PDB file of C-alpha atoms and ligand atoms in Angstrom:
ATOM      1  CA  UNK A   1      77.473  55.741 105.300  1.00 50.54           C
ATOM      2  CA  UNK A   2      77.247  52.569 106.296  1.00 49.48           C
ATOM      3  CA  UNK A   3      74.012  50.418 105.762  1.00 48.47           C
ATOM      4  CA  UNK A   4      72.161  48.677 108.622  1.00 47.17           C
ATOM      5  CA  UNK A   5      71.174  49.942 112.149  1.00 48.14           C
ATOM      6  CA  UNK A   6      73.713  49.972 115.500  1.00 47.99           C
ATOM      7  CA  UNK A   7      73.511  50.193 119.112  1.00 49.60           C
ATOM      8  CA  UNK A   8      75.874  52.813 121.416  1.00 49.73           C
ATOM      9  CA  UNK A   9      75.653  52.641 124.828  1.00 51.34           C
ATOM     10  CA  UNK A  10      75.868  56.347 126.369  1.00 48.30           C
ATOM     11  CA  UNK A  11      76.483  57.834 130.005  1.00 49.19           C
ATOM     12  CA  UNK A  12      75.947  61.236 131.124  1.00 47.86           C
ATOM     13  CA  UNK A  13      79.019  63.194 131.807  1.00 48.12           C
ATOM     14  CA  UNK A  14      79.356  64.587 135.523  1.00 49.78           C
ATOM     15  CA  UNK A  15      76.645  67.427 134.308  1.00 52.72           C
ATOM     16  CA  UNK A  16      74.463  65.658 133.204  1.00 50.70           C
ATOM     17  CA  UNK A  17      75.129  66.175 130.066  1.00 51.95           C
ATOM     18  CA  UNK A  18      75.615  64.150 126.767  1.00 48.15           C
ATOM     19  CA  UNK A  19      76.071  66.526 124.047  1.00 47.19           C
ATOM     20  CA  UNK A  20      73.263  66.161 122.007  1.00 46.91           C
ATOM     21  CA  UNK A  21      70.434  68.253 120.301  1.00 46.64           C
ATOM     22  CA  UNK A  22      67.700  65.835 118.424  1.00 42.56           C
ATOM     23  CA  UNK A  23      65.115  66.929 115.423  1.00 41.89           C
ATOM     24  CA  UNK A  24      62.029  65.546 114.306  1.00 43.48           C
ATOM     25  CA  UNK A  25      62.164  64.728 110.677  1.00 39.34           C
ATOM     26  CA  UNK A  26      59.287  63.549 108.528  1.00 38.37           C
ATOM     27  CA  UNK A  27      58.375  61.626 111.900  1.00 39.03           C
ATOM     28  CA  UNK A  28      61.763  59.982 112.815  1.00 39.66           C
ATOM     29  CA  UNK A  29      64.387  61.403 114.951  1.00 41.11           C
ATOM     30  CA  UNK A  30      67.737  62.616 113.602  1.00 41.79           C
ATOM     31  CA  UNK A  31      70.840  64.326 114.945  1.00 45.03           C
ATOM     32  CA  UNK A  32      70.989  68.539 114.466  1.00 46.79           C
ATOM     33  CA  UNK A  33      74.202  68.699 117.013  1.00 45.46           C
ATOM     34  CA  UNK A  34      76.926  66.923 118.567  1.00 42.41           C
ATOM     35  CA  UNK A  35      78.695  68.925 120.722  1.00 39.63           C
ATOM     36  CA  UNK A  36      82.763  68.289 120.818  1.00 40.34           C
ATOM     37  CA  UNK A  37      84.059  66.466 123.628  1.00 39.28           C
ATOM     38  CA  UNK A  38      80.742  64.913 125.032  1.00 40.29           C
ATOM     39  CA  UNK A  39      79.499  61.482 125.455  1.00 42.67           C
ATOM     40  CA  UNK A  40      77.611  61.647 122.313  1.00 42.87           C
ATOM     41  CA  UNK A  41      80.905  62.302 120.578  1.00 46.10           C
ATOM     42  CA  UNK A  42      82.817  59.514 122.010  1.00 42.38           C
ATOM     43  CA  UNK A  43      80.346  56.924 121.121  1.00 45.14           C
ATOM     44  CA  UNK A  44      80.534  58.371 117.574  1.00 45.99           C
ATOM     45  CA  UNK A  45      76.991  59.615 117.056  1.00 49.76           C
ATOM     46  CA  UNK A  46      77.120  62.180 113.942  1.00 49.38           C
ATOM     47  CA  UNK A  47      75.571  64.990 112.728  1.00 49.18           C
ATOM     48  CA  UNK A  48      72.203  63.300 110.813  1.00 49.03           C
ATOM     49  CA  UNK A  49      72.110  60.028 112.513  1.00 43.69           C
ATOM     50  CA  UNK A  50      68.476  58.363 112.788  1.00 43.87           C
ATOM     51  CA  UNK A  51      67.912  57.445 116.291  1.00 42.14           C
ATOM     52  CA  UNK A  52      65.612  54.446 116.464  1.00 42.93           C
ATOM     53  CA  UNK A  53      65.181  54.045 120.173  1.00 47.78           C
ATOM     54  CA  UNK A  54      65.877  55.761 123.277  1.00 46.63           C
ATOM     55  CA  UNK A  55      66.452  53.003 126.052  1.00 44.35           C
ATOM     56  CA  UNK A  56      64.478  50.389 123.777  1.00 43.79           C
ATOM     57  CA  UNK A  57      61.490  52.741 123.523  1.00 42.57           C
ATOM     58  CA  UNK A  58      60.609  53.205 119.883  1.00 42.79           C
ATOM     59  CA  UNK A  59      61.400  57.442 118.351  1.00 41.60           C
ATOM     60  CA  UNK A  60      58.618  57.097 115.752  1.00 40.58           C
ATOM     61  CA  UNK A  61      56.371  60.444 116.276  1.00 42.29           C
ATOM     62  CA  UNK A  62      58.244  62.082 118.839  1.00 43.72           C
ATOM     63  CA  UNK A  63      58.460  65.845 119.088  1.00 42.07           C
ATOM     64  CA  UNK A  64      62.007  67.552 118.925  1.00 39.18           C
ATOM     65  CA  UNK A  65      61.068  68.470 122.807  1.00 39.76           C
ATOM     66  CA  UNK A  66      60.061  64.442 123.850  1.00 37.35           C
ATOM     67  CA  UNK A  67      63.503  63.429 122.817  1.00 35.62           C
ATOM     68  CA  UNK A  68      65.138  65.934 124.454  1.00 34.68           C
ATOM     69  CA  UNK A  69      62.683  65.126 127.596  1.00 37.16           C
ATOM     70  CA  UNK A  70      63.259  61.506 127.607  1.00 38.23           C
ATOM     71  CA  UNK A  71      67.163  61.699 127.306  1.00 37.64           C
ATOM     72  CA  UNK A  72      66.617  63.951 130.735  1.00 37.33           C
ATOM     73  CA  UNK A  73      63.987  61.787 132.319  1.00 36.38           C
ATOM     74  CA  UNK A  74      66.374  58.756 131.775  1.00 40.83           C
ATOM     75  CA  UNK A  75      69.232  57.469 134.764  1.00 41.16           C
ATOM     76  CA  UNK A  76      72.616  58.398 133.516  1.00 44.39           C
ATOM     77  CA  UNK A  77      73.851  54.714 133.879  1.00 44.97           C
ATOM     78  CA  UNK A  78      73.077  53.591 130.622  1.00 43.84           C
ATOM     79  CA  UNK A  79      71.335  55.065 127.643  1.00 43.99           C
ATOM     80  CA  UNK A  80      71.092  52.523 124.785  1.00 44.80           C
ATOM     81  CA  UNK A  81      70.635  54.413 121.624  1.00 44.37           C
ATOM     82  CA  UNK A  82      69.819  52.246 118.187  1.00 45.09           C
ATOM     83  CA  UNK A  83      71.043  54.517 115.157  1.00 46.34           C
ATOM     84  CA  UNK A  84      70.914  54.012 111.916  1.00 45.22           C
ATOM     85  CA  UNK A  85      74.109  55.813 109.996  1.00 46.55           C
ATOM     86  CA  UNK A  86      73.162  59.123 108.272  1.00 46.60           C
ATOM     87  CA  UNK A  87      70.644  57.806 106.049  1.00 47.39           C
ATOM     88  CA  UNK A  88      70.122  61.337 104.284  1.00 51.63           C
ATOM     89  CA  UNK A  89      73.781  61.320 103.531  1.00 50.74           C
ATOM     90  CA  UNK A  90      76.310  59.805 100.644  1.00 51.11           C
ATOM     91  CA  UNK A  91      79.578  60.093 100.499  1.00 49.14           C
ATOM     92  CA  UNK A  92      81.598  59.978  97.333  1.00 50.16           C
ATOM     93  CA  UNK A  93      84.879  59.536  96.102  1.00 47.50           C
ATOM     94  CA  UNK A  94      87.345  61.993  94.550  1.00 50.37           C
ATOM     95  CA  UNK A  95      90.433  62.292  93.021  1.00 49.84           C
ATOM     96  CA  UNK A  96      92.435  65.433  92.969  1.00 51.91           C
ATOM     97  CA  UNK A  97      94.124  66.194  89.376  1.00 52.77           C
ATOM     98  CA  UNK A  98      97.983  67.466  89.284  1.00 54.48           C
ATOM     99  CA  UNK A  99      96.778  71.348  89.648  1.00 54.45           C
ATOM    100  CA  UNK A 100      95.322  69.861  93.108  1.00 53.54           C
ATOM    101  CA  UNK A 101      91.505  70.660  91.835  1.00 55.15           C
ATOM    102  CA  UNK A 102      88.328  68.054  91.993  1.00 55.04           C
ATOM    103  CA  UNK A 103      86.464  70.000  90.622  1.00 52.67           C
ATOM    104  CA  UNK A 104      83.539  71.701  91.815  1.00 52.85           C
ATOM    105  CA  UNK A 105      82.367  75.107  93.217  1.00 55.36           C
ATOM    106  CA  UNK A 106      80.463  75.657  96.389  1.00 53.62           C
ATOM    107  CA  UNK A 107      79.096  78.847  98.365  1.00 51.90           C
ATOM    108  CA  UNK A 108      77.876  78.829 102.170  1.00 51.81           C
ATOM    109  CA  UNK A 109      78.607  74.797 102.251  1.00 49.11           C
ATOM    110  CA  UNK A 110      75.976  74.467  99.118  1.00 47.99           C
ATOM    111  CA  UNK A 111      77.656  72.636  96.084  1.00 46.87           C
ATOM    112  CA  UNK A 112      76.741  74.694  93.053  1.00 49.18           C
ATOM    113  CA  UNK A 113      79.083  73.399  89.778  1.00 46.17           C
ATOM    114  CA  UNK A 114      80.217  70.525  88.360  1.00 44.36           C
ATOM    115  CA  UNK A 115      83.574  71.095  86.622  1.00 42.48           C
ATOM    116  CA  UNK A 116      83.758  69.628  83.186  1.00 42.90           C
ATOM    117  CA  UNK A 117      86.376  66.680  82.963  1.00 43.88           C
ATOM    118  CA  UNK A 118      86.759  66.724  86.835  1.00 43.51           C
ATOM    119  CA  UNK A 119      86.517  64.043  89.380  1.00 44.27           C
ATOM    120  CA  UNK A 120      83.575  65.736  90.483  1.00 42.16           C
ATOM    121  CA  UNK A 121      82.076  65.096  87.422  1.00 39.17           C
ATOM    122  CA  UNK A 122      83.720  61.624  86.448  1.00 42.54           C
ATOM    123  CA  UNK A 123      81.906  60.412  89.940  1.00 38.37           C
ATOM    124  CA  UNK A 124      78.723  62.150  89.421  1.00 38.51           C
ATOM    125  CA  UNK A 125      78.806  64.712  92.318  1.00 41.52           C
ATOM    126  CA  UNK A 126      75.175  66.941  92.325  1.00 42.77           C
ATOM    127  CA  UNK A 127      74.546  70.687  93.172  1.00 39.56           C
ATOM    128  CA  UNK A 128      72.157  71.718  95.959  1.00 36.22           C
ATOM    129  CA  UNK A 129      73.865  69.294  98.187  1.00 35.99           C
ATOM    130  CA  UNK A 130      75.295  70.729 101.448  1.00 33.36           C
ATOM    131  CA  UNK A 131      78.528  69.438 102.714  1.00 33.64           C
ATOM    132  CA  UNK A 132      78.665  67.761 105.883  1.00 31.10           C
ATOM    133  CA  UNK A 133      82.033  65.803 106.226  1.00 32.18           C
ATOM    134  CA  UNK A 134      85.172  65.900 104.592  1.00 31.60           C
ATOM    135  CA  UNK A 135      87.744  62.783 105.282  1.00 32.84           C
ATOM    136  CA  UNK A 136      85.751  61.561 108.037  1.00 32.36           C
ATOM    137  CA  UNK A 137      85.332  64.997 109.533  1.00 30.01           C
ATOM    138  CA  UNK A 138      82.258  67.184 109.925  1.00 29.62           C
ATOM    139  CA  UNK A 139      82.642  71.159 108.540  1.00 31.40           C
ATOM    140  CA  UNK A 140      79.444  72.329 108.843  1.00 31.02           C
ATOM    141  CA  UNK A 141      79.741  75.809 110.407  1.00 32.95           C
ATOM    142  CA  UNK A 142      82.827  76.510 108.949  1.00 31.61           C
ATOM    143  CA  UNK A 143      83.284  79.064 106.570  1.00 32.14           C
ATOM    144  CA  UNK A 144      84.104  78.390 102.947  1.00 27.99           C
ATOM    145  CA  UNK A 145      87.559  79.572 103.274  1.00 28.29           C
ATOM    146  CA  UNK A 146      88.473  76.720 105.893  1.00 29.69           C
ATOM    147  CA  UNK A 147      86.318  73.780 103.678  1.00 28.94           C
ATOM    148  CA  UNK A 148      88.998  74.987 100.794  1.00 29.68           C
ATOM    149  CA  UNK A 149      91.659  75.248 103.439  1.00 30.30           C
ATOM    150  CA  UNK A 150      90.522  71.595 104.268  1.00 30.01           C
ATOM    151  CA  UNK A 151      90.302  70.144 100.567  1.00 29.93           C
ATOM    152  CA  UNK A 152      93.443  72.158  99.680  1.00 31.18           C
ATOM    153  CA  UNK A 153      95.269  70.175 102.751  1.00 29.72           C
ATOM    154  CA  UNK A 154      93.873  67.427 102.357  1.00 33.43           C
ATOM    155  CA  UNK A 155      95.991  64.195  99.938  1.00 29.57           C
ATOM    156  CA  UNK A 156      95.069  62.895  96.650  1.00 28.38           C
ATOM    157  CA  UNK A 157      91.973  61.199  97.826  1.00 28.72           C
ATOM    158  CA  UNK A 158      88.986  63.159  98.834  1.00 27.82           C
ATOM    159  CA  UNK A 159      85.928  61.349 100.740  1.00 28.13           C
ATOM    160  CA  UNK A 160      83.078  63.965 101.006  1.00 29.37           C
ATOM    161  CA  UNK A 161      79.608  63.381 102.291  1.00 30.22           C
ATOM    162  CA  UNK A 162      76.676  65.397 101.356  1.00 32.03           C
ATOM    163  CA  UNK A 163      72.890  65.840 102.339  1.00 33.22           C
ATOM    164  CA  UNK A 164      70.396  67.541  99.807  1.00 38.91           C
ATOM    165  CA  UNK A 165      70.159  70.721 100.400  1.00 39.95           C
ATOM    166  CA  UNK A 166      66.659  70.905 101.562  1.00 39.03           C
ATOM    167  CA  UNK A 167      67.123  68.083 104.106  1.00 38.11           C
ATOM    168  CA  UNK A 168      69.752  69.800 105.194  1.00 38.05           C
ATOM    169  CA  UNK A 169      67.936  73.407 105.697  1.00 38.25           C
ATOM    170  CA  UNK A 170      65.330  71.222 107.676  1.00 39.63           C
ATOM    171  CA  UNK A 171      67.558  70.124 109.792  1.00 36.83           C
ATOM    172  CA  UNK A 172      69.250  72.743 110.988  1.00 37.26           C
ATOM    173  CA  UNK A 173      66.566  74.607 111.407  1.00 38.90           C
ATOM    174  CA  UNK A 174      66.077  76.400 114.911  1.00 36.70           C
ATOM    175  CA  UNK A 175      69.937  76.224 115.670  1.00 37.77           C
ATOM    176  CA  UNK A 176      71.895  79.737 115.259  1.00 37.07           C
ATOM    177  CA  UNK A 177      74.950  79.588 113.109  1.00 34.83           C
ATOM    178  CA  UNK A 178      77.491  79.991 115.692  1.00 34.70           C
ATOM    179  CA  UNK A 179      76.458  77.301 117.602  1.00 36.69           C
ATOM    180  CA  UNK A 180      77.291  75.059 114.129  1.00 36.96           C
ATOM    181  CA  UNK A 181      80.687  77.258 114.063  1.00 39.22           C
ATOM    182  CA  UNK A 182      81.430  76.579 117.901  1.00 38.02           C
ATOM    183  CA  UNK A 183      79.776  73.879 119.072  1.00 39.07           C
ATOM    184  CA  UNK A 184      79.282  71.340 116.402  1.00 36.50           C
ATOM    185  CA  UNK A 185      81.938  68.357 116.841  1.00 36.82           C
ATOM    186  CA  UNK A 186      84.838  69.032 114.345  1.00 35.95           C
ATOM    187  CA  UNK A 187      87.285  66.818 115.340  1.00 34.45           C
ATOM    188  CA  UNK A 188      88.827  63.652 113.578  1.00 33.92           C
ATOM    189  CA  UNK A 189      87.532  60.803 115.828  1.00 32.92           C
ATOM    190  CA  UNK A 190      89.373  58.990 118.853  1.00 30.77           C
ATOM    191  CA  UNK A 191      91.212  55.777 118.893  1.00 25.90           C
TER     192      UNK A 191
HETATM  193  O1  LIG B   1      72.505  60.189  98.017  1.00 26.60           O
HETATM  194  C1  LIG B   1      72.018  61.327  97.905  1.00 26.60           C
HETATM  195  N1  LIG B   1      72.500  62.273  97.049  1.00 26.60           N
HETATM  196  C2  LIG B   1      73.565  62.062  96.120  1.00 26.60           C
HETATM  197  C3  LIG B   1      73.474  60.936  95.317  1.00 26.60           C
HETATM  198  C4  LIG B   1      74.454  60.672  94.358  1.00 26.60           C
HETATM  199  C5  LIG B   1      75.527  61.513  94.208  1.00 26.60           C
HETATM  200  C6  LIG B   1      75.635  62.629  95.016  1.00 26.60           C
HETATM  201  C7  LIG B   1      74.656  62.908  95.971  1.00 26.60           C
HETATM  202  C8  LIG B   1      70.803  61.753  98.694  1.00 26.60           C
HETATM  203  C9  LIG B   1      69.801  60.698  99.071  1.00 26.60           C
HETATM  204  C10 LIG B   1      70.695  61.251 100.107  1.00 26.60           C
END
């Protein structure tokens, strides 16, 4: 999560397309989907970006369906976007022990214990948090069984980012699970 606000220039793909779904949130606008291999994903817009402007026009007030109307309405040349980094997120820190635990237990994404003596609980991780990334990577759609999979695959280090829970139901709110499981950008980024 980094702190302070960025621009991304974006351009529509030949259909017109950029790979984005937007949601109003207490009156900004943040990200609810980034669909893999778009234009959204290659500029590196995530899943609960703030969008500030659209084409230097301010976001404040806007309606789920005026975002999605404006990013229409606009010429593909060049869509300026100014984002500030997942501002309902934190990431934090772990450190897998030599039986390859950190030390936590989760259900449906939803941390839910804090393991005594863990890293988990060494670095202060909370319950009622949804996972959204692991190492860099976004896993929300994927079943709990392939987040272990991850973390069990993963090195020593673990980097994890997490939204409360209820910012996180509000968000993706109005967006089928499969969509999450199929669409949503999973990929380690491009170089
Ligand atoms: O930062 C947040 N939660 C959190 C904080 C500390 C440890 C673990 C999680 C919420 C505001 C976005």
């Amino acid at each position: 999560i980094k702190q302070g606000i960025r621009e991304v220039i974006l351009c529509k793909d030949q259909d017109g397309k950029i790979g984005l779904r937007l949601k109003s949130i207490d009156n900004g606008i943040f990200v609810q989907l980034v669909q893999a291999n778009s234009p959204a994903s290659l500029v590196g817009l995530r899943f609960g970006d703030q969008v500030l402007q659209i084409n230097g026009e301010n976001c404040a007030g806007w309606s789920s369906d005026k975002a999605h109307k404006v990013l229409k309405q606009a010429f593909g040349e060049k869509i300026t976007m100014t984002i500030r980094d997942r501002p309902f997120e934190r990431t934090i820190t772990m450190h897998k022990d030599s039986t390859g635990h950190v030390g936590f237990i989760f259900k449906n994404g939803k941390i839910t214990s804090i393991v005594k003596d863990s890293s988990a609980a060494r670095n202060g991780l909370l319950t009622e948090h949804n996972i959204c990334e692991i190492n860099g990577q976004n896993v929300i759609g994927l079943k709990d069984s392939q987040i272990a999979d991850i973390l069990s695959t993963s090195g020593t280090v673990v980097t994890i980012t997490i939204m409360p829970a209820f910012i996180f139901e509000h968000i993706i709110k109005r967006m089928a699970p499969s969509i999450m499981k199929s669409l949503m950008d999973h990929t380690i980024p491009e170089v």
